[PDB]
């Protein structure tokens, strides 16, 4: 009775996601004046979110609904490969757009002419180059495969796919994927986070008769109760064995997808976009 209740929510998260990509993507490339130098980032997280959607969301859907991997072997590894890349591209890109916000505020007179056109390709190629080394790389080679006995089967079998990592793989994975960019994130938030109340406290002293916490802590509460349960039980499962189950792992992974659908509607707000979604409806 219950069979088509997950489906319709699945297929709305997938369209959200969709049409959230698609219209930030084609805004960007429509219209010039939101052209600049900071926008590749953005456009390269739209793209990342946008391949995600596509690609990962459907198939992983589909196979939870029916409870069988009906597609052949082949296209597991490529599905899993897919994901692994999608979520460590989106992570780097959002380290670098905070770096770049970083940058800009610190240390001014410098930022116009320390960056360019040339060197944001360069960085997102590199940033991208990257993530792919640790996601086609191992997954397509038979490497991380599991020593003991389970899911041996399941490697053998074609009708089974399920997720079974060493223990060394996955905490690579997860320092080269989530804690640095979290570390460098509050560093670099808690810098500006000063440098603005400082800048405050000058204008009250100067003129004598928070937006910028409030705009903080909603991109920092929304990427840490997205994205920190996950690679938290992710850590320790592998550690020990039994001390987790396959549903509330699964259903972390699931709610850690929903970040995707959120960046566009949290990194745009500016009245430029605003008249560029206006000027389509
Ligand atoms: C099946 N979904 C996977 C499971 C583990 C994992 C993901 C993404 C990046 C990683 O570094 C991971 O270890 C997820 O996309």
Not at 21 to 48: D, G, H, M, P
Not at 66 to 84: A, L, M, Q, R, Y
Request: proline share 2%.
């Amino acid at each position: 009775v219950w069979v088509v209740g997950m489906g319709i929510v699945m297929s709305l998260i997938v369209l959200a996601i969709v049409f959230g990509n698609v219209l930030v993507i084609t805004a960007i490339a429509k219209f010039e004046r939101l052209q600049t130098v900071t926008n590749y980032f953005i456009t390269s997280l739209a793209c990342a979110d946008l391949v995600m959607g596509l690609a990962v969301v459907p198939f992983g859907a589909a196979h939870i609904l029916t409870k069988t991997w009906t597609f052949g072997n082949f296209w597991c590894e490529f599905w899993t490969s897919i994901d692994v890349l999608c979520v460590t591209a989106s992570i780097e890109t959002l380290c670098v757009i905070a770096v770049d916000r970083y940058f800009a505020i610190t240390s001014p007179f410098k930022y116009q002419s320390l960056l360019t056109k040339n060197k944001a390709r360069v960085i997102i190629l590199m940033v991208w180059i990257v993530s792919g080394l640790t996601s086609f790389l191992p997954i397509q080679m038979h490497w991380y495969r599991a020593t003991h006995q389970e899911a041996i089967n399941c490697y053998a079998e074609e009708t089974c796919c399920d997720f079974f990592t060493n223990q060394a793989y996955a905490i690579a994975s997860s320092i080269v994927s989530f804690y640095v960019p979290l570390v460098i994130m509050v560093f670099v938030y808690s810098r500006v986070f000063q440098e603005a109340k400082r800048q405050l406290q000058k204008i009250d002293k100067s003129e004598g008769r928070h937006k910028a916490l409030k705009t903080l802590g909603i991109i920092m509460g929304t990427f840490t109760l997205c994205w920190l349960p996950f690679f938290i039980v992710n850590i320790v499962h592998v550690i020990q064995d039994n001390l987790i189950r396959k549903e509330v792992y699964i259903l972390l992974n699931w709610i850690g997808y929903v970040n995707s659908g959120f960046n566009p509607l949290i990194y745009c707000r500016s009245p430029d976009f605003r008249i560029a979604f206006q000027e389509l409806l």
